[PDB]
Write a protein that binds this DNA or RNA. Structure first.
Lengths: 56, 345
DNA sequence: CTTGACAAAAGTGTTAAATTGTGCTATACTGGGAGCTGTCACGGATGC
């Protein structure tokens, strides 16, 4: 259960990082994830996904 | 129950297929070499950004928070590094993420073949570590074999891993074993000897004499060598060993304390001290005081002829003959009075 | 009590021989293991 947010250039975040609605994952401050979760960065497929996970 | 605990804790994850195996090793080595190329980037060392990978992966500050009061500075040697490569172009960043996923791969790998370790060490019970203890040390063996293995070798990781398991296990028991610490090579030769002893005990149809077994060993091995290391073999016997036919009869309280003085000894020492103290005044006022040095009385430390000579302004030879005449004058008083005739041991 | 001479006890410097600590081994080894009894009384937590 997750929501994909494929980027274009570089990245702001890394594999394993907590985010909330209104955050910029990647894309030089373009793409914006709205939900709580641990972001995971997949290089090849070029995507940073937000799984629904509360940091607890 | 902590035993069956880990027993169900290991089976919580599948082991692996050949595919998954090779893939694991793949992203592992690619990750590590990515760390290499990263070491060429900002000028960081080889092992630096590696443990830093653990800093941002294995968790939050919890990793370096309490590795003793000293391990390595977190806010100083780590923090800036975490932010130093964040400023870097696409290449160094992709290498970064490669490092992350790679190390994670190392972990998963480790857990599977940890199931394997569990079996292996499960066969070694009775070494002085009941189950888990043993197993745990054994486990870390695999860990060292994890980073030293190459997928290129086309070998099932179980092999390499296994040998390293028996490595960690045998080194651990060599370094723990009996309550008395023993050097590794020593333990080696020990179990070596007992090996031989076993074998020819079964072959000869009886226990060997020291010389024939020691000969069965080889050159320079004699009865005295085996008897020696055999004396070292046996460990300290527990004080809690119950003796007799009852529960209440113990061992530990049956040991005499000679390390401390005894009332008879206290008064004996005090006696020699006092009786000699009054026997002091019957000597020449100079030669008595001098005698207190040469025999190490005054400060407890014996002063040489040169020092006592440097005391009374007399040559050391003077002090020497002083000692002769003093000890002999005292000898007259002794051979006469017969007071201190005791203390003859 | 004294000066020089000298033997031995003792001090120190440098090495050879021993002792000890370390790393690694590649076919493939991938979820233990051992059992034990013939009370009894009460206090407390806990499952009915």
């Amino acid at each position: 259960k997750a929501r994909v947010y494929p980027f274009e250039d570089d990245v702001e975040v890394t594999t394993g990082d907590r985010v909330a609605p209104g955050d910029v994952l990647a894309d030089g401050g373009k793409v914006k994830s709205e939900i709580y979760g641990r972001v995971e960065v997949d290089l090849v497929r070029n995507v940073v996904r937000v799984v629904e996970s509360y940091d607890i | 129950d902590p035993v069956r605990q880990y027993l169900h804790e290991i089976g919580q994850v599948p082991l692996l297929t050949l595919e998954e195996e090779i893939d694991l090793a793949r992203k592992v080595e690619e990750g590590m070499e990515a760390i290499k190329k990263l070491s060429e980037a900002t000028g960081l060392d080889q092992e630096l950004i590696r443990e830093v990978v653990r800093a941002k992966i294995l968790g939050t500050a919890r990793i370096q928070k309490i590795p003793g009061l000293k391990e390595k500075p977190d806010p100083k040697t780590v923090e800036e590094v975490d932010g130093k490569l964040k400023s870097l172009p696409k290449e160094l960043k992709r290498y970064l993420h490669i490092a992350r996923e790679g190390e994670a791969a190392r972990q998963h790998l480790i857990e599977a073949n940890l199931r394997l370790v569990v079996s292996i060490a499960k066969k070694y019970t009775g070494r002085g570590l009941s189950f888990l203890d043993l197993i745990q040390e054994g486990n870390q063996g695999l860990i060292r074999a994890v980073e030293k293995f190459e997928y290129k070798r086309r070998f099932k990781f179980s092999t390499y891993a296994t040998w390293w398991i028996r490595q960690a296990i045998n080194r651990a028991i060599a370094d723990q074993a009996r309550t008395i610490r023993i050097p590794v090579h020593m333990v080696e030769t020990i179990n070596k000897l007992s090996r031989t002893a076993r074998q020819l005990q079964q072959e000869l149809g009886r226990e060997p004499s020291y010389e024939e077994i020691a000969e069965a060993m080889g050159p320079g091995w004699d009865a005295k060598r085996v008897e020696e290391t055999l004396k070292i073999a046996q460990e300290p016997v527990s004080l809690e060993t119950p003796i007799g036919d009852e529960k209440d009869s113990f061992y530990g309280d049956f040991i005499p304390d000679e390390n401390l003085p005894s009332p008879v000894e206290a008064a004996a020492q005090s006696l020699l001290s006092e009786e000699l103290e009054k026997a002091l005044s019957k000597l020449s006022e100079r030669e008595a005081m001098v005698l207190k040095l040469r025999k190490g009385l005054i400060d407890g430390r014996e002063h040489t002829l040169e020092e006592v000579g440097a005391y009374f302004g007399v040559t050391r030879e003077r002090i020497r003959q002083i000692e002769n005449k003093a000890l002999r004058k005292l000898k007259y008083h002794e051979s006469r009075t017969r007071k201190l005739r005791d203390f003859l041991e």
